[PDB]
Amino acid sequence: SADLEATLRHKLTVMYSQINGASRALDDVRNRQQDVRMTANRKVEQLQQEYTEMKALLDASETTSTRKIKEEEKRVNSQFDTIYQILLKKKSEIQTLKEEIEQSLTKRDEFEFLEKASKLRGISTQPVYIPEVELNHKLIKGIHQSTIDLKNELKQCIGRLQ
Amino acid sequence: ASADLEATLRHKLTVMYSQINGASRALDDVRNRQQDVRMTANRKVEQLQQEYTEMKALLDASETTSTRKIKEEEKRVNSQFDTIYQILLKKKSEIQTLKEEIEQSLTKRDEFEFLEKASKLRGISTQPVYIPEVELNHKLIKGIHQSTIDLKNELKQCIGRLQE
Structure with missing residues (x-):
């Protein structure tokens, strides 16, 4: 008869413990979720760096080429300065x-x-002779195309990785 | 005698006067070839510059397109945990x-x-609940991470030979 009530009392006690079991488990999931978020961001930050470093490399070759072109410009306008x-x-x-x-x-x-x-009458003179000078067009073309030949090969790599 | 001399001088003067204009035309000519040289150089820098801008747009896609792929997985897995919660x-x-x-x-x-x-x-379970294991797909992620390195290196190696 009254055994039933006392069983209930004891059950109440066990329940209380189950609730905490659940609450531990709930906290556990919220924490595995954060870990997952951390590890993602970590890997994004990692791959973000690669691209930054990629940009640094592109930025060198761009500058290094540009300079090569400007060096030629200067080369030639110097010759003309000397002709002038x-x-x-x-x-x-x-x-x-x-x-x-x-x-x-x-x-x-x-x-x-x-x-x-x-x-x-012995002092004769003659017209002025511009010698032929120009921008080395093979060198420049060579570059212009070649930086395209990069773009396309960079495009084709972004191909096979993605 | 002095008849011929003075007449030779007259002709000389007009050869010369004309050569002086040749010289002034020649001077303008070089200044003009110099502008042209300046215009063509700048064109080609401005053109070289565009390639790289376009290169950067391409890198910027793949970067974001990869990032999404990682975030999509994050969501995939945090959804499973949401379901467990x-x-x-x-x-x-x-x-x-x-x-x-x-x-x-x-x-x-x-x-x-x-x-x-x-x-x-009696209709309430007495057992622990069974958290299954949910993991970020590690092969997929590693796969990417390494693979973007495999890009960096091959982009570096292109820039090498496409620059010597």
């Missing part, structure tokens, strides 16, 4: 001989002219 | 309820009340 120099001289010197020859025929009838005149 | 909470509740019921019932002291509360307790 040479041409200005040619101009001013020819200018001087014009000025000489002209002011010589100022005084055509002095006896001294026939002497000065024949001297100036 | 659900199972466990429902257990806790059924028990906690029946404790509260049985408890306030001992106020009243009806041995039928008891028989009933006894039969309710």
